[PDB]
């Protein structure tokens, strides 16, 4: 029933990897790409807006890479999704739709928004295998 | 992010129209279609599974049509969606997924399912005049 | 931007084939499926609503014919039965007129093509 | 039945905001984002191709921001959509689809293209 | 990339369950729905075309209309979702530009046409 | 049945145009856009990741433009798609889907990946 966009999935992956390595020095996009079986050049397109938003910082050099732009408990899943995908809309509200159905979509939207706004990177990084 | 189709939207429309007219005798698909500016012949494709699930009952005769198969408080948005669109719980996954990476999407899925399972036809009919 | 599904596409295929054979006796779904390289059992799922809408008639013994003259049936009539409404457009809550305007104009233009394109016109295109 | 992409919707929003503020000096992306309850960092991804196309101009400095690259009557909804989303193709045409159906998709495409090419930012900004 | 919907997914579920129970008497849609945690009334919408195509036979339950090795994923998908061959094209498409998408389409069709229910029934849980 | 993304379609178009002009000097995005009836400013959004991956090289100047970053036989359709779209996943795998269906999606994925990994720009440019 639920669909997860590639931008959102992998943008959150970058952030979670960085949260797991918080205080352990920079992490190269190359290593995140290698860990997650994807192109570093695909990942670069996702980090760019995260870097512009100050959610991540790029450290230059041979031992360079990315770090979080704030503590993991100060970044939410919602902060990340809003930068990469724009506003949250789980069910599109359509022109002249019945108020009962519009109310159902608002309730769904509020419940999704509450999950995004109450889930920090620290919380997600705490899940291990 | 949620894949509720035209089937689900209009299947909910039928159920809401019937909940608003609960205890007021049968309602024809023709009048529901007329009220909502849709083809009755599109709506007919949605009633058959709703009728098979016992969510609606067909009353024969010239003054016949449809009634709810239960009280509005005994039918949820989730009950309707499951019949018309299939399961609510499935979420897109990666093979051998790591708990940290999958977690956000599970929380979103659970929050959506909770809204759908806790919103009754009585609740939907209360959102409108 | 317009979501016409496989249902709509093949529902139009049925109607166009029947318009081409108008006044030439009944046409079986098997024949339409064979001509179009698809399953008759996929096409069967589309005929029932078209028949209920009176867009097609089933001849016992046999096959299908149009329920009206080709010039009296539009692409719009067919799409509404198989896919649902053509008008609804995705809107933002507390929408400003300037921002929504373009999408209303697009919706109206699409609806006009669908409502003014008849089966007689479409049946005149071949090969 | 009609789907509106996020890129198209919000790219068009930036342009409409700039058309409403035409002749009122530069407008920062931050204020457009604030007005529309969006991240400025989401909007940045849409403005870069619009700037590359000359549809918007960036004015530097303390009072800097964006302005339109031409008069609002000289920019169409079509000019904006082509930069952000590529070619206008409302219904995808499928291999070996019959000529009658191919014709219907072409007619829909032409009608959409006419609306896009005949609607200016001046026209859209005129709606209160 | 693929036009494989909930209809196709659950239509495959029905066929796989029936292949697993081949020669073990009829199986109801209710038990298939119970095994797979979904509505029997959603599955009921999928059986009618499978029955019309002779892929399933109705006896209170269903059996396969042929041996599991004689039914492919392609046979099932074609009935429920429509053709496998159509691919999105540009008008006046040049061969070099369309080629990759034709090759992808052919490879997908080959997987579907070469996968049988006997093969699929060997994967358990 | 098969859907082709705009990014993938046009990203591949850029690479194919460059492969056809390999050894014929630089090609501007303006001429590729003109040949393909699309905006150069839409194409520019696709070239930047391809340039970052070293799949194309930009030659500066008034007679500048793009060239391939390697020989056409050394670049695959898979190298291009992975940069622009991410991982190849034709049918999404859903939580708790039965192993028989998960296996079918893996087989589709492997067959698509084999086409992408075995098709070079030299191969495509030869048509
Ligand atoms: Cl890095
Ligand atoms: Cl700015
Ligand atoms: Cl260039």
UniProtKB/Swiss-Prot annotation, chain F:
GO terms for molecular function: core promoter sequence-specific DNA binding; DNA-binding transcription factor activity; identical protein binding; protein homodimerization activity. Residues 3-126 form the HTH rrf2-type domain. GO terms for biological process: protein heterooligomerization; regulation of DNA-templated transcription. Keywords: DNA-binding, Repressor, Transcription, Transcription regulation. Residues 29-52 bind DNA. InterPro entries: TR_Rrf2-type_CS (IPR030489), Tscrpt_reg_Rrf2 (IPR000944), WH-like_DNA-bd_sf (IPR036388), WH_DNA-bd_sf (IPR036390). One of its GO terms (cellular component) is cytosol. Disruption phenotype: Grows slowly with cystine as sole sulfur source. PROSITE patterns: HTH_RRF2_1, HTH_RRF2_2. The keyword Repressor applies. It comes from the Bacteria. The keyword Transcription applies. NCBIfam families: Cys_reg_CymR (NF047409), rrf2_super (TIGR00738). Homodimer. Forms homotetramers at higher concentrations of protein. Forms CymR(2):CysK(2) or CymR(4):CysK(4) complexes in the absence of O-acetylserine. Master repressor of cysteine metabolism in B.subtilis. Controls the expression of genes involved either in cysteine synthesis from sulfide (cysK), sulfonates (ssu), or methionine (mccAB) or in cystine uptake (tcyP). Activity of CymR is positively regulated by CysK in response to cysteine availability. When cysteine is present, the pool of O-acetylserine (OAS) is low, which leads to the formation of a CymR-CysK complex and transcriptional repression of the CymR regulon occurs. This is HTH-type transcriptional regulator CymR. It comes from Bacillus subtilis (strain 168).
């Amino acid at each position: 029933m639920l669909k997860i966009s590639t931008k959102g999935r992998y943008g959150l992956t970058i952030m979670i990897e960085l949260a797991k390595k918080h205080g352990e020095g920079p992490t190269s996009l190359k290593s995140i790409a290698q860990t997650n079986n994807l192109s570093e050049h695909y990942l670069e397109q996702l980090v760019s807006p995260l870097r512009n938003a100050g959610l991540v910082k790029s450290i230059r050099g041979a031992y360079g890479g990315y770090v979080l732009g704030s503590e993991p408990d100060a970044i939410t899943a919602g902060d990340i999704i809003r930068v990469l995908e724009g506003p949250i809309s789980p069910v599109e509200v359509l022109e002249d739709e019945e108020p009962a159905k519009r109310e159902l979509w608002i309730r769904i939207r509020d419940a999704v928004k509450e999950v995004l706004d109450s889930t920090t990177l620290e919380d997600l990084a705490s899940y291990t295998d």
